[PDB]
Design an enzyme around this catalytic site. Structure first.
Site, PDB file in Angstrom:
ATOM      1  N   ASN A 148      -3.051 101.157 138.939  1.00  0.00           N
ATOM      2  CA  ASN A 148      -2.127 102.277 139.068  1.00  0.00           C
ATOM      3  C   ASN A 148      -1.848 102.978 137.743  1.00  0.00           C
ATOM      4  O   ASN A 148      -0.984 103.860 137.693  1.00  0.00           O
ATOM      5  CB  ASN A 148      -0.808 101.806 139.691  1.00  0.00           C
ATOM      6  CG  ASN A 148      -1.011 101.095 141.015  1.00  0.00           C
ATOM      7  OD1 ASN A 148      -0.733  99.903 141.138  1.00  0.00           O
ATOM      8  ND2 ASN A 148      -1.496 101.826 142.014  1.00  0.00           N
ATOM      9  N   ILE A 153       0.871 107.073 135.279  1.00  0.00           N
ATOM     10  CA  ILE A 153       1.386 105.995 136.115  1.00  0.00           C
ATOM     11  C   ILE A 153       1.527 106.523 137.534  1.00  0.00           C
ATOM     12  O   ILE A 153       2.239 107.509 137.765  1.00  0.00           O
ATOM     13  CB  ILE A 153       2.732 105.465 135.602  1.00  0.00           C
ATOM     14  CG1 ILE A 153       2.634 105.086 134.124  1.00  0.00           C
ATOM     15  CG2 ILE A 153       3.188 104.278 136.438  1.00  0.00           C
ATOM     16  CD1 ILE A 153       3.980 104.948 133.446  1.00  0.00           C
ATOM     17  N   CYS A 154       0.866 105.865 138.481  1.00  0.00           N
ATOM     18  CA  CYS A 154       0.997 106.224 139.892  1.00  0.00           C
ATOM     19  C   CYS A 154       2.249 105.549 140.437  1.00  0.00           C
ATOM     20  O   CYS A 154       2.211 104.428 140.946  1.00  0.00           O
ATOM     21  CB  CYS A 154      -0.245 105.823 140.676  1.00  0.00           C
ATOM     22  SG  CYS A 154      -0.344 106.604 142.296  1.00  0.00           S
ATOM     23  N   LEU A 155       3.378 106.244 140.321  1.00  0.00           N
ATOM     24  CA  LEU A 155       4.663 105.747 140.799  1.00  0.00           C
ATOM     25  C   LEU A 155       5.366 106.887 141.517  1.00  0.00           C
ATOM     26  O   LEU A 155       5.634 107.928 140.909  1.00  0.00           O
ATOM     27  CB  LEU A 155       5.511 105.219 139.639  1.00  0.00           C
ATOM     28  CG  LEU A 155       6.670 104.276 139.957  1.00  0.00           C
ATOM     29  CD1 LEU A 155       6.186 103.072 140.747  1.00  0.00           C
ATOM     30  CD2 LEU A 155       7.346 103.832 138.668  1.00  0.00           C
ATOM     31  N   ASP A 190      -2.897 102.634 146.581  1.00  0.00           N
ATOM     32  CA  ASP A 190      -2.674 103.939 145.961  1.00  0.00           C
ATOM     33  C   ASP A 190      -3.452 103.953 144.648  1.00  0.00           C
ATOM     34  O   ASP A 190      -2.861 103.948 143.559  1.00  0.00           O
ATOM     35  CB  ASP A 190      -1.188 104.206 145.731  1.00  0.00           C
ATOM     36  CG  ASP A 190      -0.877 105.680 145.547  1.00  0.00           C
ATOM     37  OD1 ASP A 190      -1.792 106.456 145.192  1.00  0.00           O
ATOM     38  OD2 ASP A 190       0.293 106.062 145.753  1.00  0.00           O
TER      39      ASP A 190
END
Ligand SMILES: [Zn+2]
Ligand SMILES: [Zn+2]
Lengths: 149, 71
Positions: free
Chosen positions: A79, A86-88, A119
């Site tokens: 992520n 950052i995949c958040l 994700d």
């Protein structure tokens, strides 16, 4: 950014009085809209023992727009990519003006402990996390030794 | 997508009273004082009028529970 500046100072004072267990954050110099953060690798993770640096840039209309948070320390994680992105969801579509930097840091720590391969910001690492967990753990430990120690 | 001024104005507003229990607006992280104007959403979460109105001009959900403000 007068209202943004007041909230940034408020968050900085709250962080100083009640520091979060594994994270610290604060302005680099005199630019209150640009912070450095440091996150210790979670003990239940292959990132244990490492220290990971991040940048935080607050927009002028914070907190009505999310801060830009990115790793500067290289890290092997499905992520987080080589640009530090950052995949958040709370940093993107799920941002809320009730969120704070301390909550963002806690969420990043939970992401280090529990990656989300469904994700995939880095599909190849998510592929390895799904199909070969011990290989992911070995490489994540190797990168922590090389870049975060 | 945000709400119109009319849809925002249809939401309940109150003045923080001398006898009211202290609360903190989650948007500006500031405790209310007497005379403050507060706007409450259908989900019962409330904020400073100026705080929540600015969010609702470009968004349509509650900052705390993320429920849609409109039906
Ligand atoms: Zn407020
Ligand atoms: Zn709500």
């Amino acid at each position: 950014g007068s209202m943004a500046l007041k909230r940034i100072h408020k968050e900085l004072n709250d962080l100083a009085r009640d520091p979060p267990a594994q994270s610290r954050a604060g302005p680099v110099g005199d630019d209150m809209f640009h912070w450095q953060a440091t996150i210790m690798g979670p003990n239940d993770s292959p990132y244990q023992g490492g220290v990971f640096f991040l940048t935080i840039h607050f927009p002028t209309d914070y907190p009505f727009k999310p801060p830009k948070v990115a790793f500067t320390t290289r890290i092997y994680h499905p992520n987080i990519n080589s640009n530090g992105s950052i995949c958040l969801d709370i940093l993107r579509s799920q941002w809320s003006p009730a969120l704070t930097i301390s909550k963002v840091l806690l969420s990043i720590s939970s992401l280090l402990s529990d990656p989300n391969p469904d994700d995939p910001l880095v599909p190849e690492i998510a592929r390895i996390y799904k199909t070969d967990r011990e290989k992911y753990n070995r490489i994540a430990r190797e990168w922590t030794q090389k870049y975060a120690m | 997508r945000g709400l119109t001024k009319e849809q925002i104005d249809n939401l309940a507003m109150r003045s923080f009273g001398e006898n009211d229990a202290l609360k903190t607006c989650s948007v500006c992280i500031t405790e209310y004082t007497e005379g403050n104007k507060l706007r409450k959403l259908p989900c019962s979460h409330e904020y400073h009028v100026h705080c929540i109105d600015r969010w609702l001009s470009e968004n349509s959900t509650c900052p705390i529970c993320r429920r849609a403000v409109l039906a």
